Design an enzyme around this catalytic site. Sequence first.
Site, PDB file in Angstrom:
ATOM      1  N   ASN A 157       0.812  -1.187  -0.017  1.00 48.53           N
ATOM      2  CA  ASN A 157      -0.078   0.279   0.018  1.00 48.53           C
ATOM      3  C   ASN A 157       1.030   1.319  -0.011  1.00 48.53           C
ATOM      4  O   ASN A 157       0.308   2.335   0.409  1.00 48.53           O
ATOM      5  CB  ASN A 157      -0.939   0.147   1.239  1.00 48.53           C
ATOM      6  CG  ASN A 157      -1.870  -0.903   1.081  1.00 48.53           C
ATOM      7  OD1 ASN A 157      -2.504  -1.031  -0.043  1.00 48.53           O
ATOM      8  ND2 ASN A 157      -2.507  -1.656   2.021  1.00 48.53           N
ATOM      9  N   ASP A 170      -4.089   4.409   0.223  1.00 49.94           N
ATOM     10  CA  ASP A 170      -5.456   4.118   1.038  1.00 49.94           C
ATOM     11  C   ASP A 170      -6.621   3.429   0.389  1.00 49.94           C
ATOM     12  O   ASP A 170      -7.275   4.405  -0.172  1.00 49.94           O
ATOM     13  CB  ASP A 170      -5.597   5.189   1.846  1.00 49.94           C
ATOM     14  CG  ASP A 170      -6.412   4.557   3.306  1.00 49.94           C
ATOM     15  OD1 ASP A 170      -6.720   3.517   3.189  1.00 49.94           O
ATOM     16  OD2 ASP A 170      -6.432   5.410   4.065  1.00 49.94           O
TER      17      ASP A 170
HETATM   18  C1  LIG Z   1      -5.082  -6.205  -6.920  1.00 47.20           C
HETATM   19  C2  LIG Z   1      -4.009  -5.931  -7.525  1.00 47.20           C
HETATM   20  C3  LIG Z   1      -4.273  -4.594  -7.826  1.00 47.20           C
HETATM   21  O1  LIG Z   1      -5.002  -4.278  -8.836  1.00 47.20           O
HETATM   22  N1  LIG Z   1      -3.586  -3.234  -7.264  1.00 47.20           N
HETATM   23  C4  LIG Z   1      -3.434  -1.889  -7.577  1.00 47.20           C
HETATM   24  C5  LIG Z   1      -3.093  -0.871  -6.815  1.00 47.20           C
HETATM   25  C6  LIG Z   1      -3.322   0.409  -7.507  1.00 47.20           C
HETATM   26  C7  LIG Z   1      -3.838   0.855  -8.490  1.00 47.20           C
HETATM   27  C8  LIG Z   1      -4.126   2.135  -9.139  1.00 47.20           C
HETATM   28  N2  LIG Z   1      -4.002   3.297  -8.207  1.00 47.20           N
HETATM   29  C9  LIG Z   1      -4.806   3.577  -7.170  1.00 47.20           C
HETATM   30  O2  LIG Z   1      -5.997   2.961  -7.086  1.00 47.20           O
HETATM   31  N3  LIG Z   1      -4.785   4.804  -6.440  1.00 47.20           N
HETATM   32  C10 LIG Z   1      -5.927   5.258  -5.547  1.00 47.20           C
HETATM   33  C11 LIG Z   1      -7.157   5.824  -5.901  1.00 47.20           C
HETATM   34 CL1  LIG Z   1      -7.795   5.403  -7.604  1.00 47.20          CL
HETATM   35  C12 LIG Z   1      -8.195   6.212  -4.749  1.00 47.20           C
HETATM   36  O3  LIG Z   1      -9.417   6.517  -5.487  1.00 47.20           O
HETATM   37  C13 LIG Z   1     -10.211   6.725  -4.405  1.00 47.20           C
HETATM   38  C14 LIG Z   1      -7.446   6.289  -3.765  1.00 47.20           C
HETATM   39  C15 LIG Z   1      -5.967   6.168  -3.437  1.00 47.20           C
HETATM   40  O4  LIG Z   1      -5.906   6.447  -2.141  1.00 47.20           O
HETATM   41  C16 LIG Z   1      -6.461   7.373  -1.284  1.00 47.20           C
HETATM   42  C17 LIG Z   1      -5.258   5.753  -4.351  1.00 47.20           C
HETATM   43 CL2  LIG Z   1      -3.789   5.388  -4.092  1.00 47.20          CL
HETATM   44  C18 LIG Z   1      -2.922   4.037  -8.514  1.00 47.20           C
HETATM   45  C19 LIG Z   1      -1.658   3.424  -9.241  1.00 47.20           C
HETATM   46  C20 LIG Z   1      -0.720   4.156  -9.382  1.00 47.20           C
HETATM   47  N4  LIG Z   1       0.615   3.597 -10.022  1.00 47.20           N
HETATM   48  C21 LIG Z   1       0.572   2.263 -10.163  1.00 47.20           C
HETATM   49  C22 LIG Z   1       0.935   1.816 -11.234  1.00 47.20           C
HETATM   50  C23 LIG Z   1       0.930   0.221 -11.481  1.00 47.20           C
HETATM   51  C24 LIG Z   1       0.743  -0.373 -10.408  1.00 47.20           C
HETATM   52  N5  LIG Z   1       0.994  -1.713 -10.538  1.00 47.20           N
HETATM   53  C25 LIG Z   1       1.421  -2.578 -11.576  1.00 47.20           C
HETATM   54  C26 LIG Z   1       1.437  -3.899 -11.535  1.00 47.20           C
HETATM   55  N6  LIG Z   1       1.017  -4.694 -10.490  1.00 47.20           N
HETATM   56  C27 LIG Z   1       1.046  -5.935 -10.258  1.00 47.20           C
HETATM   57  C28 LIG Z   1       0.677  -3.998  -9.216  1.00 47.20           C
HETATM   58  C29 LIG Z   1       0.496  -2.643  -9.390  1.00 47.20           C
HETATM   59  C30 LIG Z   1       0.587   0.025  -9.256  1.00 47.20           C
HETATM   60  C31 LIG Z   1       0.199   1.536  -9.206  1.00 47.20           C
HETATM   61  N7  LIG Z   1      -0.600   5.342  -9.004  1.00 47.20           N
HETATM   62  C32 LIG Z   1      -1.554   5.753  -8.426  1.00 47.20           C
HETATM   63  N8  LIG Z   1      -2.916   5.238  -7.986  1.00 47.20           N
HETATM   64  C33 LIG Z   1      -4.566  -0.283  -9.120  1.00 47.20           C
HETATM   65  C34 LIG Z   1      -4.432  -1.553  -8.818  1.00 47.20           C
END
Ligand SMILES: *CCC(=O)Nc1ccc(CN(C(=O)Nc2c(Cl)c(OC)cc(OC)c2Cl)c2cc(Nc3ccc(N4CCN(C)CC4)cc3)ncn2)cc1
Length: 273
Positions: A157, A170
């Site tokens: 996270n 989060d």
């Molecule tokens: C179950 C596995 C999975 O699908 N994990 C995952 C983690 C993170 C994301 C996308 N991001 C995200 O959701 N950010 C977010 C959002 Cl949308 C909200 O909305 C309410 C709130 C908060 O927190 C307050 C957060 Cl953080 C996200 C992703 C990224 N960059 C990123 C790029 C690639 C990956 N990645 C690639 C490959 N694997 C295997 C895992 C993860 C993760 C993150 N930046 C910002 N936000 C989607 C899925």
Amino acid sequence: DPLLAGLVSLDLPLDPLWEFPRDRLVLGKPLGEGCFGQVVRAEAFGMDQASTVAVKMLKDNASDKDLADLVSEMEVMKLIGRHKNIINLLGVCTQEGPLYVILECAAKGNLREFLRARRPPGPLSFPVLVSCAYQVARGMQYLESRKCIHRDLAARNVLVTEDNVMKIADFGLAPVKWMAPEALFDEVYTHQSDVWSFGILLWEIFTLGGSPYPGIPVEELFSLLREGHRMDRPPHCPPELYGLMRECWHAAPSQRPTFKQLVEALDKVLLAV
Ligand SMILES: *CCC(=O)Nc1ccc(CN(C(=O)Nc2c(Cl)c(OC)cc(OC)c2Cl)c2cc(Nc3ccc(N4CCN(C)CC4)cc3)ncn2)cc1
């Protein structure tokens, strides 16, 4: 699901502090594997200079509860305020179109994968690792000061930006191996229980993305932790940093360090280097 099926238009309140021009936004390709809704990478103009952002929207078969959950997360991110070491809200589109939530993009994925991918057979030297820990601690200290309890702090996270900045994510604004005993037992969640999880995150960092309590079934953990079991020192870990970890895992919440102390301790180690 009434509101979504029934309303030809969704009359959410205009909040001018956050509303963002839909024509200054360009949606790109999916980001991650959407365990947490449909999340998309995008380019955003004039935040006349473009910058890469992440955008969350409703899945095309979203329920009314999906709508409420996205709106709730949205509203919670508004109150938290900006900090360098957290994923910040950048904007919203609520007026006259689909609901979009615009936020910071972290190009390099979560911290667990980042570390695992760069394991040696260096890149993950002591200073880099301490720096990761330090940044997260600063993020948590900020969150604490805003009275926010995370409840799910873990390397999976924490997100890593293009410039290797740590940004706490989060996914719970609307697991067991990271929970303080009091949270396992009585579902008590405090800043001090976050400190416990930070200790586990610290162990995660210095085992370069290792999985906590290896070979131990999740059902056994509580009696184990009650009987005083704690993870051992990682190979890549000075006794002094391990000392910090172990203080985070104190049974008594009051005898765990605060995040302010964790920040100051980690800062000193950084200077020393
Ligand atoms: C179950 C596995 C999975 O699908 N994990 C995952 C983690 C993170 C994301 C996308 N991001 C995200 O959701 N950010 C977010 C959002 Cl949308 C909200 O909305 C309410 C709130 C908060 O927190 C307050 C957060 Cl953080 C996200 C992703 C990224 N960059 C990123 C790029 C690639 C990956 N990645 C690639 C490959 N694997 C295997 C895992 C993860 C993760 C993150 N930046 C910002 N936000 C989607 C899925």
